Amino acid sequence: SSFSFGGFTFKRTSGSSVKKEEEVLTGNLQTLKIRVHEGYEEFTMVGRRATAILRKATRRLIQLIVSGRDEQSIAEAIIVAMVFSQEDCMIKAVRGDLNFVNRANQRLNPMHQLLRHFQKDAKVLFQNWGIEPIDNVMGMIGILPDMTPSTEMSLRGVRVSKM
């Protein structure tokens, strides 16, 4: 029930899943083979600089409530969770080819190639994830694709909590 991904320790608190290999198409129509976890699961994500509560279904991020030291660490947690969710809109935000041949990419599986890609630049990821109107849940705030806080709109499923 415990593992690490992208610098975060994930702790499953509810649900379960089975694993299966699956092919997915990027925004540049490149086929990647990823190990998909099938099932509804809830997690706590614990990093050095941020933590979050994550609820996910098969290839769908349902909710992510993230707190952390500042915008850079909160954004990094959001990126890791978006990649971890394996959502189609994250796969489709890859607009160029993923380099799997360079000697330094020879051991990254596709999940880690995706993570590195969006760690270098997440602008397309955030712009294509989608936004939604939000309500007045005190203690929490919305975050826009450009990472500025908002009390009216937020990246779909994502809220920022005070630390």
Ligand X SMILES: CN1CN([C@@H]2O[C@H](COP(=O)(O)OP(=O)(O)OP(=O)(O)O)[C@@H](O)[C@H]2O)c2nc(N)[nH]c(=O)c21
Contact 139, 161 (CB under 8 A): yes
**Least distance from C-beta 15 to ligand X, angstroms?**
9
Which two structure tokens, joined as six digits, stand for 115? 């993570």
Contact 43, 11 (CB under 8 A): yes
With contacts defined by CB under 6 A, name the span among 34-42, 67-75, 89-97, 142-150 that binds ligand X: 34-42
Among candidate residues 123, 134, 125, the one with its CA nearest the CA of residue 157: 134
The helix (H) or strand (E) run that includes residue 64 is strand 60-68
Binding map of ligand X across residues 69-108, x = CB under 6 A, - = no contact? ---------------x-x----------------------
Q: Check binding of 13 to ligand X (CB under 6 A).
A: no
Q: Check binding of 63 to ligand X (CB under 6 A).
A: no
Binding site for ligand X (CB under 6 A): 3, 5, 12, 17, 35, 37, 41, 84, 86, 109, 111
